[PDB]
Amino acid sequence: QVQFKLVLVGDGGTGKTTFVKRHLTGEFEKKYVATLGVEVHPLVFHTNRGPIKFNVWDTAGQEKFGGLEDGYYIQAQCAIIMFDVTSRVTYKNVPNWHRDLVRVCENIPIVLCGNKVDIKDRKVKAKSIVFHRKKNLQYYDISAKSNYNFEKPFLWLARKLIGDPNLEFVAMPALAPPEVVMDPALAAQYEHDLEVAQTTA
Numbered sequence: 324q325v326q327f328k329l330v331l332v333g334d335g336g337t338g339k340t341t342f343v344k345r346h347l348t349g350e351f352e353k354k355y356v357a358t359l360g361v362e363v364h365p366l367v368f369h370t371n372r373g374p375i376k377f378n379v380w381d382t383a384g385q386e387k388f389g390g391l392e393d394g395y396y397i398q399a400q401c402a403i404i405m406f407d408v409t410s411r412v413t414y415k416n417v418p419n420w421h422r423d424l425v426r427v428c429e430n431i432p433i434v435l436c437g438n439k440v441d442i443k444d445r446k447v448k449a450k451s452i453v454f455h456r457k458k459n460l461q462y463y464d465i466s467a468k469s470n471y472n473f474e475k476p477f478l479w480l481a482r483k484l485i486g487d488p489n490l491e492f493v494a495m496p497a498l499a500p501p502e503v504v505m506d507p508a509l510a511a512q513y514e515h516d517l518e519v520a521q522t523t524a
């Protein structure tokens with residue numbers, strides 16, 4: 324099978340568990356591995372070139388108590404580092420998560436996601452999101468509770484791993500129905516503001 328270990332990391336409380344859980348089959352088929360303090364969710368996605376399975380590793384909360392063991396990171400073939408757009412500290416801690424990860428796994432494709440963009444009161448705006456630039460990471464705004472941009476990180480990663488820049492998803496996996504509305508106007512403003520921030524580089 325055409326699988327990839329994906330490591331999902333970032334501060335406690337940023338929405339990691341909530342985000343992996345959108346993918347309903349992935350949630351139903353998860354596998355808990357107590358030796359490592361993890362739930363591995365098999366998130367299958369279907370591309371114009373067939374299926375790709377991301378085995379997403381979700382913590383059991385130990386990130387609140389400290390850093391993650393070598394256990395968690397080894398063999399990762401990709402990753403998502405998450406922060407909370409309503410907390411500057413969580414963004415401020417991004418560099419530390421990236422450093423812990425690349426320590427074990429040097430040349431991985433990584434996406435950075437700013438979560439909870441459904442919240443009107445946004446603290447970490449596009450202009451302040453610079454970490455990913457010099458590190459060659461993709462960035463996406465995300466709202467786990469509304470599925471907003473759910474696919475984006477996975478689609479960019481599938482492209483890097485398969486080596487097809489044109490890959491697309493032919494159908495979406497069944498997702499948990501949006502629990503909160505993502506205001507369409509905020510989405511439009513934010514996507515552009517990222518594009519405006521990128522041209523100051």
Ligand SMILES: Nc1nc2c(ncn2[C@@H]2O[C@H](COP(=O)(O)OP(=O)(O)O)[C@@H](O)[C@H]2O)c(=O)[nH]1
Nearest residue numbers: 334335336337338339340341439441466467468
């Ligand atoms: N509105 C909103 N709240 C969110 C979102 N993602 C997470 N939260 C809230 O953030 C808290 C932490 O979420 P959790 O998924 O357990 O995160 P984790 O500790 O990083 O794995 C809970 O109150 C979530 O419901 C999001 O997309 N929108």
Ligand SMILES: [Mg+2]
Nearest residue numbers: 339340382384
């Ligand atoms: Mg969690």
